[PDB]
Amino acid sequence: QDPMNSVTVSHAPYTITYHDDWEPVMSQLVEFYNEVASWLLRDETSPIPDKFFIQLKQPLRNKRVCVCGIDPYPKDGTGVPFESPNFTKKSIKEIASSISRLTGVIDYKGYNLNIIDGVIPWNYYLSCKLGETKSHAIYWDKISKLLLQHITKHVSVLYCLGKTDFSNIRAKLESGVTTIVGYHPAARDRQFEKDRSFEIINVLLELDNKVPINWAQGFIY
Amino acid sequence: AMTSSADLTNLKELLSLYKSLRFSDSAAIEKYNSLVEWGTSTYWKIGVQKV
């Protein structure tokens, strides 16, 4: 009847709600999250505990690309990776620039990777301590692998932003996937400005007889 | 490097070759398999094989 299921854990947020496509990882997500949630809930988090897992509501079977950041915004994380609903955060604004240039859409008010057909934005680590990037890495480790493994069974192309953050990504995955590791949008020297990953992904898709991503659908007018 | 204009140029050429797949000589075919092998090593896995 409904694609949404729900399972119960013994720490906030207590209930994790998911789309059917995530089923095969839940028994272990629950098991792993219960042994660490206690330590993790000691510090205040971006995003809040109730938002940690909202991206488990997203179907996988229609996903061709995973656009992956290392962890949420150190502040104002909504649990939707990359999302800044007021169009405030530097990373998303920079990404909106790359795609203005590519598509020639010059007048726009916002940009969200989570409304783009075929794309699933993702955070390798599901939280951090407020203000501190990578603080919860040691807690998320087993989960983060589990979840990204699952996603890469569905997607043709995994795109990671963070050359230093993601230099060892292949170690974290069982079976191979088309993997591109790009510059963080706040990399030095404007390097992300001359980074053509969005175009490279589409060509790679065409080579795996998939349909390319319409990057313009992310725009908010 | 993987993210450069050069990377995008080489994948486009690989794509264009894959489409026609009528090689007229043994350096066209070698270009293709060389691209495939470069693509595979740079991105881990891509959706075309050597011929």
From Swiss-Prot, chain A:
GO terms for biological process: DNA repair; viral DNA genome replication. The keyword Plastid does not apply. It is an enzyme of class 3 (hydrolase). Keywords: DNA damage, DNA repair, DNA-binding, Hydrolase. Signal peptide: none annotated. CDD domains: UDG_F1_VAVC_D4-like (cd19372). It catalyses: Hydrolyzes single-stranded DNA or mismatched double-stranded DNA and polynucleotides, releasing free uracil. Plays an essential role in viral replication as a component of the DNA polymerase processivity factor. Excises uracil residues from the DNA which can arise as a result of misincorporation of dUMP residues by DNA polymerase or due to deamination of cytosine. Belongs to the uracil-DNA glycosylase (UDG) superfamily. UNG family. This is Uracil-DNA glycosylase. It comes from Vaccinia virus (strain Copenhagen). The gene is OPG116.
UniProtKB/Swiss-Prot annotation, chain B:
Interacts with the DNA polymerase catalytic subunit OPG071. Interacts with UDG/OPG116. Component of the uracil-DNA glycosylase(UDG)-OPG148-polymerase complex; OPG148 and UDG form a heterodimeric processivity factor that associates with OPG071 to form the processive polymerase holoenzyme. Interacts with OPG117. It comes from the Viruses. This is DNA polymerase processivity factor component OPG148. It comes from Vaccinia virus (strain Copenhagen). Belongs to the orthopoxvirus OPG148 family. The gene is OPG148. Plays an essential role in viral DNA replication by acting as the polymerase processivity factor together with protein OPG116. Serves as a bridge which links the DNA polymerase OPG071 and the uracil DNA glycosylase.
